[PDB]
Amino acid sequence: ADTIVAVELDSYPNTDIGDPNYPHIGIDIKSVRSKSTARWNMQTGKVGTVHISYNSVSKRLSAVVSYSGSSSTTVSYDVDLNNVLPEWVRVGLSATTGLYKQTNTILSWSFTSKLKNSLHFSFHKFSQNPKDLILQGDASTDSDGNLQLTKVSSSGDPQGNSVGRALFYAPVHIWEKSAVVASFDATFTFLIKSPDREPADGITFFIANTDTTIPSGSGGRLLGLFPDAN
Amino acid sequence: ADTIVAVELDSYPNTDIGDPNYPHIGIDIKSVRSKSTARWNMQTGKVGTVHISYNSVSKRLSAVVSYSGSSSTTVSYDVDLNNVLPEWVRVGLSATTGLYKQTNTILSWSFTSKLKNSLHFSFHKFSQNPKDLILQGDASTDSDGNLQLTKVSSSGDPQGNSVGRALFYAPVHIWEKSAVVASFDATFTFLIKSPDREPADGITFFIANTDTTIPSGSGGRLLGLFPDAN
Amino acid sequence: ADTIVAVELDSYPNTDIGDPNYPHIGIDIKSVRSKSTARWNMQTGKVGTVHISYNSVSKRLSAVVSYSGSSSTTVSYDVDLNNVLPEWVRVGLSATTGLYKQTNTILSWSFTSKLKNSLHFSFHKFSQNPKDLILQGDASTDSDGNLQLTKVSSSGDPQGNSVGRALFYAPVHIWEKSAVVASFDATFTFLIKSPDREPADGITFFIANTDTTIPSGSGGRLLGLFPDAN
Amino acid sequence: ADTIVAVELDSYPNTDIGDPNYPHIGIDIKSVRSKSTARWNMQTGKVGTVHISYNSVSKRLSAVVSYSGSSSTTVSYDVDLNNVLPEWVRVGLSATTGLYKQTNTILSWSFTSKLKNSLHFSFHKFSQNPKDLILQGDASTDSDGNLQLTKVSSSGDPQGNSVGRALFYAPVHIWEKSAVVASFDATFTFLIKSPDREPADGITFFIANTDTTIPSGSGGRLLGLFPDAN
Ligand SMILES: OC[C@H]1O[C@H](Oc2c[nH]c3ccc(Br)c(Cl)c23)[C@@H](O)[C@@H](O)[C@@H]1O
Ligand SMILES: OC[C@H]1O[C@H](Oc2c[nH]c3ccc(Br)c(Cl)c23)[C@@H](O)[C@@H](O)[C@@H]1O
Ligand SMILES: OC[C@H]1O[C@H](Oc2c[nH]c3ccc(Br)c(Cl)c23)[C@@H](O)[C@@H](O)[C@@H]1O
Ligand SMILES: OC[C@H]1O[C@H](Oc2c[nH]c3ccc(Br)c(Cl)c23)[C@@H](O)[C@@H](O)[C@@H]1O
Ligand SMILES: [Ca+2]
Ligand SMILES: [Ca+2]
Ligand SMILES: [Ca+2]
Ligand SMILES: [Ca+2]
Ligand SMILES: [Mn+2]
Ligand SMILES: [Mn+2]
Ligand SMILES: [Mn+2]
Ligand SMILES: [Mn+2]
């Protein structure tokens, strides 16, 4: 199956598969059961920002989520991604909804990779036909230039049981055997609105094998990334 | 047929079809018959460097070729590429040999585009299997990490009647209806060695429609870019 | 006297020293009387954006001003800036008021120089004590993180007969004898509000000798750059 | 006294003041007695490369030293620089010799810093009179465009008992009250030649209070950074 590394903004506590009993950000290494989590003070209706970083000498993957004026949540995990990921990968964003729902709106996205070659892209607006994105599932761009990862209505209300992803078109070379150091950094901003008492399910930035696709049965709590909850 | 904009390093004068009667650099807008040329101050067997720039406010496409800072050649052409290229393009390098030949060896390649969105890539080495490149024709990477656009013997001798290109995998968004300014910059370094008194044929950097392919009959003098010499 | 290259956003027509009789953007080379101008559709109270670019192979200095949802104004001038500028410079922003007035509020500023060596800075907020800026005249930063080039009261009301500049602290190496190409790009966003029927005087981005200071007599129509109107 | 954070490339084991008994790289937090070290297979006469990285979320400072076709040396250390350094710093390079000696030749240096505002500089050659560096002590640039941190003769032969440093002219803003994440990355390439059987003393990259100067008594084993060995 696919090989997945991800940072999850997990809106809904699925304590039956190991989630903590609160909204959380987490670091997922080949399993939906995060190797490290931190409590996330989710704020419906406000734009948030996530920053993600990794360095192969440090061997530490880190993420921070924040909102204007409010305080930040951070999570880190010690890992050597070279013992986890292949040499070439793709990078993307995923989101799901399930029985409960929320908008999974992406307002901007940037990524930089360096191998010692380099790759850098940034979107502050998404076009009507983003030919540099591989859109999977229900993901689509709307009339305002925003990336709606899961289905939203004509008037802006989210739908349940929706899944979608967006991958950057070009593969990324993140290691080699003559390699001295590799790094990446990513940023995205997002807007989550929900009519539900308990919004669900979440948003991820993830890194996978180049031929990755939405797995069978990855809806809801599995965030469009994993085929099961092992 | 493809839509083509290129900067050509034309080592062999094909007066047949409008080449000036000397090795030259040129700017090609939808034709092999350059809109602007300059006599090429060459140094065969030395590493040369090419810098290409364009800005949609200035409406000026420019290139400089130099050899370790010496022996400079420049060419420029006033043009609004918005009325020439489609909104989404691919960018790449091409080269050919013909009856006469030369190595068409790329040692590095970088490109940056900004729309007001941005894309930047840079290769100081080419891997044995570059998954972020679309290799076409005879193009390949060798054991020293160099990109050989045309065929070279296992001992380094160039072969004749060869054609090859390398395209960056992801499409590039160069214009948009509400655009204020768009720009791009490209750099590459090359090594041309030849056993012939009259080496041939040349190297280009080019921009094209995303689905561009080597046209039939585009070898030698046509630089792997055009179907005919109109 | 200093040596000045500047892009001016001139809100007030001073027809006795060569201004066209409307608000205009212009390119200034060692004189307040612009080498090139374009009619500027000035919109008080709306945030504007300026992009400026130069390449030494193209030899074209270009600028564009725009507002969200409105048309753009562009101006260009053909020039080899190494005939005008020293090898080392400082880059900066300037603004004035006179009998009539306006706010000269800078919200963000970025600059990139490349010498084929590079320098790049970007500010999206100015700190209360910006130790990487040389503040001259009346320039200061306010509580909102904005750079007020000319004086405003505690209520935000602009004052007349004010002059102010901000220089980036580090000298920039914009030309070098071994260089094959030199380039720079600059962007700023600005907010000009005014209670006057004819607001005045203007904002510039400029490049000057490293020890540039506000010349005596440079108020008002001279934009804080020039000692006279020759 | 100054406040110093440094990455040391230490050629000479001074075991009386805490050095391991072999050449080593180390991370120095307000003391020459490194908080973390790694054994360094130093190779005189070959160009080496150092990459340094830090991110305020991961809170890990790391460094890697490599030569062409050799194994790398890595060192890391967990630290929150917000508790160590002031908000505004200068960044620089230092080197010493003592009774024993070596060339401390810097061929290139680059630095990037981001605060969530950004600063980036890169030198692949140094000017013979660099107006954007603060040179201290014996440091100077030569006619080849290399930065000689310690003295060399007309012949290129290094001198003993030398100390020199080079700081980038612009202060850097590495933290603030409302900061969410700060990061930096640095690279330099160096050539250490020596005629001595035990070369000495070393090279550093360092971050300090903006007004830092060479401390009295900082020669030799104190690397031009510290006044004592506590
Ligand atoms: O969207 C939130 C969740 O909705 C569903 O889970 C349930 C939430 N409340 C329930 C009540 C009953 C049953 Br049966 C189920 Cl599966 C659920 C499932 O779709 C989950 O995967 C998802 O995380
Ligand atoms: O490599 C140089 C050139 O060689 C060929 O053209 C010829 C130039 N002189 C000739 C002489 C004989 C024959 Br057959 C041919 Cl095809 C040619 C063709 O391959 C040209 O397209 C190419 O530019
Ligand atoms: O701010 C707009 C202008 O005001 C002044 O010039 C005048 C414009 N209208 C006037 C009317 C009367 C007198 Br006195 C003066 Cl100095 C002026 C001067 O300060 C000019 O430098 C400036 O351009
Ligand atoms: O450059 C190498 C070393 O030389 C000096 O230390 C000595 C090393 N071996 C010695 C032998 C004799 C005497 Br006296 C001295 Cl100072 C030393 C001192 O300068 C040290 O700080 C330095 O690290
Ligand atoms: Ca969950
Ligand atoms: Ca030809
Ligand atoms: Ca005026
Ligand atoms: Ca030592
Ligand atoms: Mn979870
Ligand atoms: Mn030609
Ligand atoms: Mn004017
Ligand atoms: Mn030591």
Question: SS3 string of C95-132?
Answer: EECCCCCCCCEEEEEEEEEEECCEEEEEECCCCCCCCC
B32, B99, B159, B162: which to mutate for ligand 2, most atoms within 8 A of CB?
Answer: B99
What 3-state class would DSSP assign to D83? helix
Q: Which residue, chain included where needed, has tokens 């405003």?
A: C152
B129 CA to centre of own chain: 21
B10 Cβ closer than 6 Å to some ligand 2 atom:
no
- The domain in which residue D106 lies consists of 1-230
Q: Which of D229, D219, D226, D228 is nearest to D97 (CA)?
A: D219
Cα-Cα-Cα-Cα torsion C203, C206, C211, C217, nearest 10 degrees, comes to -40
D98 CA to centre of own chain: 17
CA distance B52 to A224: 42
Domain count, chain D: 1
Q: Are D63 and D207 in contact (CB under 8 A)?
A: no
Task: Count the neighbouring beta carbons within 10 Å of the beta carbon of residue D87.
Answer: 18
Q: Which of A76, C152, A119, C193 is nearest to D80 (CA)?
A: A76
CA distance D4 to D6: 6
- Residue C122 with chain D: CB contacts under 8 Å: 117-118
CA distance C109 to C93: 9
- Residue-wise over D29-60: b if at least 16 C-beta within 10 A, else e? bbbbebebbbebebeeeeebbbbbbbbbbbbb
CA distance A46 to C159: 37
CA distance D152 to D161: 11
Length of chain B: 230
Strand bridging mode D47-55 / D182-191: antiparallel
Residue B222: φ, ψ to 5°: -95, 0
Q: Are D127 and C173 in contact (CB under 8 A)?
A: yes
CA distance A65 to A48: 7
Q: Which residue, chain included where needed, has tokens 């005879």?
A: B138
CA distance C56 to C179: 10
Which ligand 1 atom sits closest to the C-alpha of A200?
1
Q: Are A95 and A150 in contact (CB under 8 A)?
A: yes
> Is the C-alpha dihedral spanning D114, D119, D124, D127 positive or negative?
negative
D14 Cβ closer than 6 Å to some ligand 4 atom:
yes
CA distance A186 to A169: 16
What 3-state class would DSSP assign to B218? coil
D200 Cβ closer than 6 Å to some ligand 4 atom:
yes
Resolution in A: 1.8
Q: Which of B221, B223, B193 is nearest to B48 (CA)?
A: B193
Length of chain C: 230
Residue C136: φ, ψ to 5°: -125, 145
Strand partners, C38: C25
Compute CA distances B8 → A99, B54, B201, whole Å: 59, 15, 10
Q: Are D219 and D161 in contact (CB under 8 A)?
A: yes
- Structure-block tokens of residue B48: 């040369």
D62 CA to centre of own chain: 13
- Structure-block tokens of residue C115: 């010498």
What 3-state class would DSSP assign to C29? strand
- Structure-block tokens of residue B201: 């044929």
Cα-Cα-Cα-Cα torsion C117, C123, C129, C131, nearest 10 degrees, comes to 0
- Residue A77 with chain D: CB contacts under 8 Å: none
Pick left, alpha or beta for residue D58 (phi over 0 → left; psi -120 to 50 → alpha; otherwise beta): alpha
- What is the DSSP secondary structure assignment for residue D15, as one 8-state letter? G
Strand partners, B24: B10, B39
Task: Verify whether the Cβ–Cβ distance C57 to B69 is below 8 Å.
Answer: no
CA distance D180 to D117: 12
Q: How far apart are the first and last CA of chain B?
A: 13
Compute CA distances D174 → C122, C170, D114, whole Å: 14, 17, 7
Length of chain D: 230
What 3-state class would DSSP assign to C39? strand
D100, D194, D223: which to mutate for ligand 4, most atoms within 8 A of CB?
Answer: D100
What 3-state class would DSSP assign to C48? strand
Strand bridging mode B4-10 / B24-29: antiparallel
The shares of helix, strand and coil residues in chain A, as percent rounded to the nearest 5, are 5, 45, 50
Q: One-letter amino acid identity for D70?
A: S
CA distance D225 to D205: 10
Q: Which residue, chain included where needed, has tokens 């400079």?
A: B72
- Structure-block tokens of residue C70: 């409105």
- Residue C123 with chain D: CB contacts under 8 Å: 117
Task: Verify whether the Cβ–Cβ distance B60 to C60 is below 8 Å.
Answer: yes
CA distance A26 to A17: 14
CA distance C11 to C108: 20
- Residues near B58 by Cβ (< 8 Å), separated by ≥ 6? C53, C55, C58, C60, C62, C76
CA distance B169 to A172: 10
D201 Cβ closer than 6 Å to some ligand 4 atom:
yes
Instruction: Compute and round to an integer the Cα radius of gyration of chain C.
Output: 16
Compute CA distances A67 → B32, D31, D180, whole Å: 54, 37, 10
CA distance B31 to A126: 33
CA distance C4 to D106: 34
Q: Which residue, chain included where needed, has tokens 């930040």?
A: A72
Q: Are B218 and B150 in contact (CB under 8 A)?
A: no
A184 half-sphere exposure, CB direction, 13 A CA radius: 24
CB-closest option in C62, C72, C181 to B58: C62
Residue nearest to ligand 2 atom 9, measured at CA: B99
- Residues near A100 by Cβ (< 8 Å), separated by ≥ 6? A12, A160, A194, A196, A197, A198, A199, A200, A201
Q: Are A174 and A115 in contact (CB under 8 A)?
A: yes
Q: Chain A interface residues facing chain B, Cβ-Cβ under 8 Å?
A: 88, 117-125, 127, 129, 131-132, 168-173, 176, 210
Q: Are D114 and D182 in contact (CB under 8 A)?
A: yes
Cα-Cα-Cα-Cα torsion A119, A125, A126, A128, nearest 10 degrees, comes to -140
- Residue-wise over B128-154: b if at least 16 C-beta within 10 A, else e? eebbbbbbbbbbbbeeeebbbbbbbee
Strand partners, A216: none
Our CA-based measurement puts residue B60 at a distance from the nearest CA of chain C, in whole angstroms, of 7
Our CA-based measurement puts residue B119 at a distance from the nearest CA of chain C, in whole angstroms, of 17
CA distance C60 to C74: 13
Q: Are A11 and A218 in contact (CB under 8 A)?
A: no
Hey, which chains touch C, using 3+ CB pairs under 8 Å? B, D
Task: Verify whether the Cβ–Cβ distance C57 to B49 is below 8 Å.
Answer: no
Q: One-letter amino acid identity for B97?
A: T
Task: Verify whether the Cβ–Cβ distance B122 to A118 is below 8 Å.
Answer: yes
Q: One-letter amino acid identity for B161?
A: N
- Residue C131 with chain D: CB contacts under 8 Å: 88, 171, 173, 210
Q: Is A46 exposed, middle or buried (0-12, 13-18, 19+ CB in 10 A)?
A: middle
Nearest ligand by distance to the CA of A221: 1
Q: Are A217 and A207 in contact (CB under 8 A)?
A: no
Strand bridging mode A105-115 / A118-123: antiparallel
- What is the DSSP secondary structure assignment for residue B150, as one 8-state letter? S
* Experimental method, per PDB record: X-ray
CA distance D112 to D76: 19
Compute CA distances B132 → A205, B151, B168, D218, whole Å: 20, 21, 6, 50
Where helices occur in D71-188 by DSSP H, the ranges are none
Where helices occur in chain D by DSSP H, the ranges are none
Q: How far is the CA of A109 from the centre of ligand 1 (A)?
A: 29
Q: Are D114 and D183 in contact (CB under 8 A)?
A: yes
Kindly report whether the peptide bond that precedes residue D201 is cis, defined as omega within 30 degrees of 0: yes
Strand bridging mode B24-29 / B36-39: antiparallel
Residue A204: φ, ψ to 5°: -135, 150
Q: Are D35 and D28 in contact (CB under 8 A)?
A: yes
Q: Are D117 and D210 in contact (CB under 8 A)?
A: no
Question: Could you give the angle at the alpha carbon of B139 between the alpha carbons of B138 and B141, nearest 5°?
Answer: 130
What 3-state class would DSSP assign to B146? coil
Instruction: Compute and round to an integer the Cα radius of gyration of chain A.
Output: 16
Q: Are B32 and B74 in contact (CB under 8 A)?
A: no
Task: Verify whether the Cβ–Cβ distance D120 to C120 is below 8 Å.
Answer: yes
- Chain C and chain D share a number of CB contacts under 8 A equal to 57
Q: Are C173 and C88 in contact (CB under 8 A)?
A: yes
CA distance D23 to D13: 6
Q: Are C70 and C198 in contact (CB under 8 A)?
A: no
Q: Are B21 and B15 in contact (CB under 8 A)?
A: yes
Q: Which residue, chain included where needed, has tokens 């194994």?
A: D71
Over B32-65, what HEC string results? CCCCEEEECCCCCCCEEEEEEEEECCCCEEEEEE
Residue nearest to ligand 4 atom 7, measured at CA: D99
> Is the C-alpha dihedral spanning A30, A31, A33, A39 positive or negative?
positive
Q: Is B195 exposed, middle or buried (0-12, 13-18, 19+ CB in 10 A)?
A: exposed
CA distance A37 to A35: 7
- What is the DSSP secondary structure assignment for residue C70, as one 8-state letter? S
Question: Could you give the angle at the alpha carbon of C99 between the alpha carbons of C97 and C104, nearest 5°?
Answer: 20
CB-closest option in A53, A76, A180 to D66: A180
CA distance B216 to C164: 63
- Chain C touches chain B, with at least 3 Cβ pairs below 8 Å, answer yes
- Structure-block tokens of residue C228: 């006279």
Our CA-based measurement puts residue A36 at a distance from the nearest CA of chain B, in whole angstroms, of 32
- Structure-block tokens of residue B160: 């004749």
Q: Are C205 and C8 in contact (CB under 8 A)?
A: no
Compute CA distances C185 → A207, C56, C125, C182, D43, whole Å: 34, 12, 19, 11, 41
Q: Is C1 exposed, middle or buried (0-12, 13-18, 19+ CB in 10 A)?
A: exposed
Q: Which of C193, C126, C128 is nearest to C157 (CA)?
A: C193
Q: Are B36 and B52 in contact (CB under 8 A)?
A: no
Instruction: For B75, name the nearest residue in chain C, comparing CA atoms only.
Output: C57
Q: How far is the CA of D181 from the centre of ligand 5 (A)?
A: 26
Residue nearest to ligand 3 atom 19, measured at CA: C98
Our CA-based measurement puts residue A121 at a distance from the nearest CA of chain B, in whole angstroms, of 5
Q: Which residue, chain included where needed, has tokens 């420049």?
A: B74
D229 Cβ closer than 6 Å to some ligand 4 atom:
no
What 3-state class would DSSP assign to B166? strand
- Residue D53 with chain A: CB contacts under 8 Å: 55, 57-58, 183
- What is the DSSP secondary structure assignment for residue A161, as one 8-state letter? S
Strand partners, D131: none
Task: Look up the CATH number of the domain holding residue B19.
Answer: 2.60.120.200
Q: Are D64 and D74 in contact (CB under 8 A)?
A: yes
- Chain A touches chain D, with at least 3 Cβ pairs below 8 Å, answer yes
A160 Cβ closer than 6 Å to some ligand 1 atom:
no
Residues preceding chain discontinuities in chain D with C to N over 2.5 Å: 116
Compute CA distances B32 → A142, B23, C189, whole Å: 41, 14, 42
Task: Count the neighbouring beta carbons within 10 Å of the beta carbon of residue C21.
Answer: 9
Kindly report whether the peptide bond that precedes residue D10 is cis, defined as omega within 30 degrees of 0: no
Interface test with A, best of B85, B113, B131, B167 (most A CBs within 10 A): B131
Ion ligand 8 residues within 5 Å by Cβ: D 10, 12, 14, 19, 221
